[PDB]
Every structure is written in structure tokens, then in C-alpha cells.
Design a binder for these strands. Structure first.
Ligand code: IAS
Ligand code: MG
Ligand code: MG
Ligand code: MG
Ligand code: MG
Ligand code: MG
Ligand code: MG
Ligand code: MG
Ligand code: MG
Ligand code: MG
Ligand code: MG
Ligand code: MG
Ligand code: MG
Ligand code: MG
Ligand code: MG
Ligand code: MG
Ligand code: MG
Ligand code: MG
Ligand code: MG
Lengths: 153, 70, 66, 116
RNA sequence: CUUGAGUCUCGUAGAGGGGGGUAGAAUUCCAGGUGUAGCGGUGAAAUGCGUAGAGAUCUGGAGGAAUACCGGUGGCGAAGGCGGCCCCCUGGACGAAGACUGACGCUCAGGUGCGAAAGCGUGGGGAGCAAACAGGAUUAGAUACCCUGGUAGUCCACGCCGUAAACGAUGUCGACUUGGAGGUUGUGCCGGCGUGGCUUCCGGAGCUAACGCGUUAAGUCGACCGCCUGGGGAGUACGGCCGCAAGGUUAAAACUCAAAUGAAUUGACGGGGGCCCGCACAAGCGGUGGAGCAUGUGGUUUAAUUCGAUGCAACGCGA
């Protein structure tokens, strides 16, 4: 806004693991205010993710974020009628939000039956750079690298 | 702007001395002034306008030293 | 400031006097404005006239890229 | 094929393009690169980043001559004046001199102003 | 007669003018070397140039035009104008100490001359630029703006043209009337005190419709000249004169309107500027526009489909 009186809003950590990061994943996946319906999807998907990779409940989700988190994005800007896409580094908080949003949006447009398996299928693919969530991360990185010449105002 | 690199001088300091030498001679100012033709009627007009504003701002600055804003 | 030719009782700047003339040309051979060296207007015209005469005799250079 | 070890870099920085030519002391070109030929067209061509890449491709294209110290001629008003020189230094050359050789008439009539 | 006007003596500054020569940078072209795939251009492109070797870089040569820096609301000239450096011929201005002539002045219709640029004629020259023209874009169209090229012309000699927002939109000459801050150029006395010329800005009285001018007046006066009499028609037609032509100059009338206009004020507006704000963008979530149905409206139909609201701010509105 023009005023900048915006402050951070408190988010409770998830009950089963006490993770600030994972609670936001539930919120992004939540639809129509149905948080309970979304926790069962997140918890049963990470249960599948842990038993399929054996790493753990928590850092198995994190290693998926490492391969989806963007490092630089382009912001549109017009000078002479044609728009210049200016690459800008992404702050750490927005890196998680973009990663979680891409994972959820990539998962939703999949072919699996249950969303819990649909999410776990996409989260597992993020570990070895296969899913469509990491493919959007690549597209953002390539688009930012192509427009690297415009990294100025 | 012929710049000779000196011993034990880092490149950035040597490069910085090159900008200061070029900007001193105003080579980029001459080139931009020469890329298009200037009519003699409009070079006299811009020279006349540059002198009047350097005069006007001086009196505007002088009268500010005789004025308080609060 | 301090136009040096008036303080020295100068009547001509004597293009042959190249030691004096090199104090009024930039490192690229451009004549320094009297606004920078504080030279009187009359002697600045003699100075520019002498520098151009020295340039023609190849005593002074027109530019740095000869 | 031959060894020179001491060349001159001529940066041609114009408002539309940057051309880098690395010659010897005698004025004989060995390799060259341009911002336009470095994969940048139109708006991207006239950026300092494009000129930096041109320097990187020109340094590598002349890598088989074994240049160690390099003199620099900077010509033109383009944005890629300083960026190319810094890229040449990062390439691994010993910069001996940096000289601006932009042509200034003391001349011919310039074209008429564009009424945009 | 000497105070206005002028002459002589000494010097000063100046892009004042005419002729000639010459220097350096740069552009273009030509020949060649190095070298390889782009160059150039634009908001983006394309035309265009380039593997027949361009662009870049270096060497040599040719040619024309203009003189970076100095350079300055700096200087000179009646005005137009005048800008590298040197020589020759030449005009004017100013200053100081006198001497000399003895008002010998000012203005000036007709007349004479000079008079930017474009243009015209004849003969040369031609780098760059560039009307016309061609091509490519842009666009609804684009006989333009932009791009790539490009001929007259721009340069020289002679002759014509005689017009410009030829403007300080302010005729010339003379006198008088508070000040301040400068620039430039002399000159006298000891950086200081004067005294002349030219010139820039601010400002007092005064004047002015106001804006503004203000010792360089648009103030107070005098001398002479030019010009004006509502807007349009119209600086046009016809006639005369001038011109090779283009046209220039002098210069109406019918008719038509009741205004046209100047300055300043308050607003509004600007694809003017500056500073701020709003789910206004941006960052996101979910929608509408597609389907069925509900409802209102328009249209149509009907005997009637009651009337009203009907940009935002009518259309699940009066109901
Ligand atoms: N460039 C110089 C003359 C040549 O070119 C000028 O502008 O006056
Ligand atoms: Mg152009
Ligand atoms: Mg007459
Ligand atoms: Mg002419
Ligand atoms: Mg002719
Ligand atoms: Mg002819
Ligand atoms: Mg053109
Ligand atoms: Mg004039
Ligand atoms: Mg004028
Ligand atoms: Mg008049
Ligand atoms: Mg005034
Ligand atoms: Mg007529
Ligand atoms: Mg007639
Ligand atoms: Mg938005
Ligand atoms: Mg619908
Ligand atoms: Mg109704
Ligand atoms: Mg109605
Ligand atoms: Mg309303
Ligand atoms: Mg409603």
C-alpha cells in the first residue's frame, strides 16, 4: 500500500509437529476455510512421503522445498510501450510462499485419485527434480536468466 | 584521456581515474552535443536561456539567505 | 583566480614561451577557460591566440591523439 | 597459431551495439565479438551486460594467441564503455593502459534532429 | 565667439570588410593488410549493407565543407551579419593632452546604395547534410512524424532577386531627471581614489489599460520624418513600375458581421511539472462472461402485456 502500516500476522505452528513452515502449507492448501479437511491431506501425504523415502516426517518435506524454491523472478515494467521484465532476487519469506504455492498448484493438476496421494506424488517428484512444480521453477529461472540484461532500473 | 596504469594500483582505482579523466574533458558531453545538427538560431537561444537561469537562481538563492522559512 | 599576466607586467604572452603556455592547456591539449584559471579577459584572448600559433608550429599539440 | 603476448583491445561502444576487437600492437585483428552476435537482439543488444558478454567471448576467441597484458582503446558514447573493460580485467589480462579514442570533429554537418 | 559639428598629433580593443595562403581533428570514398559473421537501425522492426568477405582495426592516398577547446546575457558592424592561424589592402569606434576651423548642425518625401535564408542565370565544385523522389515501417488511412537511401540546393565566381517574427515587435538627433549589482575597453593619481566609451540585470519617482519601462525610458521636453483610423474581404483584384522567372512594390471596391482585439482575474482542462491518497494499480484469493434455472430490463408480440427508474449514480430498482 501507499502507507506501509502492514505487520506480520501470527500463525500457529501445526499441532502434530510444531512447524511454522508446515502450518503455512496447510493454509495454502486449505479451501473454503476447511482447515481440518486440509490437515488430513497434509498429514497423510507426509506419512506417505516419509514411508516412501525413509528420511523423516519433517525434512522430507524440506528437501522438496529446496528443489522448488526460486532464487530470482522477473517483474514487468514498461518504458517505451514494450514491457521490460526485470529480474529481482526473491526474499526468503517469498521463496517459501512461491515454493508451497507451486507445489500445491502443480499437485492439484495431476491425475492421481486422492489428493493426499496426489500431493505426496508431487512432493516425492520434487526430491529428484521431476514434477511440474520444479519445472515451473526452472521456467522462472530461465526467464530470469534470459532477461538478466535488464537487471537495472 | 590517456590513462597509464601505475604499479601496485588496483584496477578499480585505475578504472576510476579513467572515468574522472574522461568526465573532466567531457568527451561524452561533446559527442551527445554533436550527434544531431543544432540550428544557429537555437544554439543562441539555449545559450541565452542557460545564462538567464544561472542568473535567476542566484538571486533566488541570495533572497533565500534574507528569508526565514519558520 | 589571480590572473598571473597582470601581476607579471606582461604585454604579450609570446607563443614561443611554451613554459608559460603549458600552464593553460589541459592534459588533452584543450585551452583552459579563464573561468578556471581566473585570467583577465584581455590576456585570455592573447593566450588563446598564442596557443593556436604554437600549435601551428608543432610546439604544442592540438589534441592527445596525434 | 602464433604468440603475441601483448595486444590492444578496441571497444566500439555505440548507442545501439558494442563491438570488441582485440588486435596486436601493429593493428592486426586476431579475434572479435559483438553484443549482437552474443545472443542479444534489439533492446538487449544495447545494455552494459551485453557488452560484458562480448568482452568474454572476445577474450576467449583470442585465447589461442597467448595474450598476457592488454592495452585498451575505448571509442564511442555507448553504455558498454566501462562494463567491457571490467570484463576484460576479469578475463585474466594485465591492463597496461586505458585510452579514450572517441572521434571529435574540430567538421561535417550532423544529421537533423529527430522530431519524435 | 566657442560650448554643437569637424581636422591634426599619440595610442587602444575588436569574429568590421575584401583578396590570398595555410594547419589540425573528423566524415566520405579509393587501394591494401589482419579477420570472421554479422553490421546498421528502431519504441519494436524492416528496407539496406555483408561469406563476391562487410562491420571492427591498421597503412597510404584523394576530395570537399566547417573551424572543437578558447567562448563569455563577451566583442565589432547602419542593418543584414561577422568565429582556426598568417600576410596584404581597407572602414569605423574610443581614450588622453593640446592645437586648429568657427555652429560650418539635425532631420529628410522623392532618389541612391546595402540588405539573412530560400530562389533564379551562367560557369565550376560536390565530402557531409538534405526539399523532391524511392523503398521499409507506424496507422483506419499516413501523399507525414520514424528508418534506409537520395537529386536540386547547401560551397566558389559573376549577375539578379530585395523579401523575413529583417524584432528591442521600441525611427533618428539633442537636453534634463534618485540608485544598486556586474561585464568589457581606455586613462590619471596613490590593491585604494577617480574620470570617459560600450554593454547586462534589478529597481525609485514618473509613466502605462495592465504587463511592464525605468538615465541604453515606454519618464519630462524640443526638431524632423514614417505610419494608423473596427473585423473580414485583403496587402487581395485591376492599373502602373521593377524582375529572366518566382514574384516584389503601390494599392481598392462590392459585399458581409457587430464585433475583432490587448492585458490581467477566477475557474476548468493539459498525451505540463511537483507532492500526496484510495482494492487504483502491484502481490494474492475467489468470482462474472460458457451450462441449467431464478429475477429485472431491452426488443418483439399482444386485447392488455399498467406506470415509473434506464452511464458510473437504471436493470433481485419503486415492489
Ligand atoms: N566542429 C566544428 C567545426 C568542424 O566540425 C564546429 O562545430 O564549429
Ligand atoms: Mg539516424
Ligand atoms: Mg526614401
Ligand atoms: Mg543563398
Ligand atoms: Mg546557383
Ligand atoms: Mg550551374
Ligand atoms: Mg531523411
Ligand atoms: Mg535577425
Ligand atoms: Mg532578435
Ligand atoms: Mg514592423
Ligand atoms: Mg527594470
Ligand atoms: Mg501583391
Ligand atoms: Mg499588379
Ligand atoms: Mg491485481
Ligand atoms: Mg451465465
Ligand atoms: Mg417496465
Ligand atoms: Mg421512461
Ligand atoms: Mg444517482
Ligand atoms: Mg442489490
Amino acid at each position: 500500500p501507499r502507507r506501509r502500516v502492514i505487520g506480520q500476522r501470527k500463525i500457529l505452528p501445526d499441532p502434530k509437529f510444531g512447524s511454522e513452515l508446515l502450518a503455512k502449507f496447510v493454509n495454502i492448501l486449505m479451501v473454503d476455510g476447511k482447515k481440518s479437511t486440509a490437515e488430513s491431506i497434509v498429514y497423510s501425504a507426509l506419512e506417505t512421503l516419509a514411508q516412501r523415502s525413509g528420511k523423516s516426517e519433517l525434512e522430507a518435506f524440506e528437501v522438496a522445498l529446496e528443489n522448488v524454491r526460486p532464487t530470482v523472478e522477473v517483474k514487468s515494467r514498461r518504458v517505451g510501450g514494450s514491457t521490460y521484465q526485470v529480474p529481482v532476487e526473491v526474499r526468503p519469506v517469498r521463496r517459501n510462499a512461491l515454493a508451497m504455492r507451486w507445489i500445491v498448484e502443480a499437485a492439484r493438476k495431476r491425475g492421481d485419485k486422492s489428493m493426499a496421494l496426489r500431493l505426496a506424488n508431487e512432493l516425492s517428484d520434487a526430491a529428484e527434480n521431476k514434477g511440474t512444480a520444479v519445472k515451473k521453477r526452472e521456467d522462472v529461472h530461465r526467464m530470469a536468466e534470459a532477461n538478466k540484461a535488464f537487471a537495472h532500473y | 584521456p590517456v590513462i597509464k596504469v601505475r604499479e601496485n594500483e588496483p584496477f578499480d582505482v585505475a578504472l576510476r581515474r579513467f572515468k574522472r579523466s574522461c568526465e573532466k574533458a567531457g568527451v561524452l558531453a561533446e559527442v551527445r552535443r554533436r550527434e544531431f545538427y543544432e540550428k544557429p538560431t537555437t544554439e543562441r537561444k539555449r545559450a541565452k536561456a542557460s545564462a538567464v537561469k544561472r542568473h535567476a537562481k542566484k538571486l533566488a538563492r541570495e533572497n533565500a539567505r534574507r528569508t526565514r522559512l519558520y | 583566480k589571480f590572473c598571473r599576466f597582470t601581476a607579471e607586467g606582461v604585454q604579450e604572452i609570446d607563443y614561443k614561451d611554451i613554459a608559460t603556455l603549458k600552464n593553460y592547456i589541459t592534459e588533452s591539449g584543450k585551452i583552459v577557460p579563464s573561468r578556471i584559471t581566473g585570467t583577465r579577459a584581455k590576456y585570455q584572448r592573447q593566450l588563446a591566440r598564442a596557443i593556436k600559433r604554437a600549435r601551428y608550429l608543432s610546439l604544442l599539440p592540438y589534441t592527445d591523439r596525434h | 597459431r602464433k604468440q603475441v603476448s601483448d595486444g590492444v583491445a578496441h571497444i566500439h561502444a555505440s548507442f545501439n551495439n558494442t563491438i570488441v576487437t582485440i588486435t596486436d600492437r601493429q593493428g592486426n585483428a586476431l579475434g572479435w565479438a559483438t553484443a549482437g552476435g552474443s545472443g542479444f537482439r534489439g533492446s538487449r543488444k544495447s545494455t552494459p551486460f551485453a557488452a560484458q558478454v562480448a568482452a568474454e567471448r572476445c577474450a576467449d576467441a583470442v585465447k589461442e594467441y597467448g595474450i598476457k597484458n592488454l592495452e585498451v582503446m575505448v571509442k564511442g558514447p555507448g553504455p558498454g564503455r566501462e562494463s567491457t573493460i571490467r570484463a576484460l580485467n576479469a578475463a585474466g589480462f594485465r591492463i597496461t593502459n586505458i585510452t579514450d579514442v572517441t572521434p571529435i570533429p574540430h567538421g561535417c554537418r550532423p544529421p537533423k534532429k529527430r522530431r519524435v
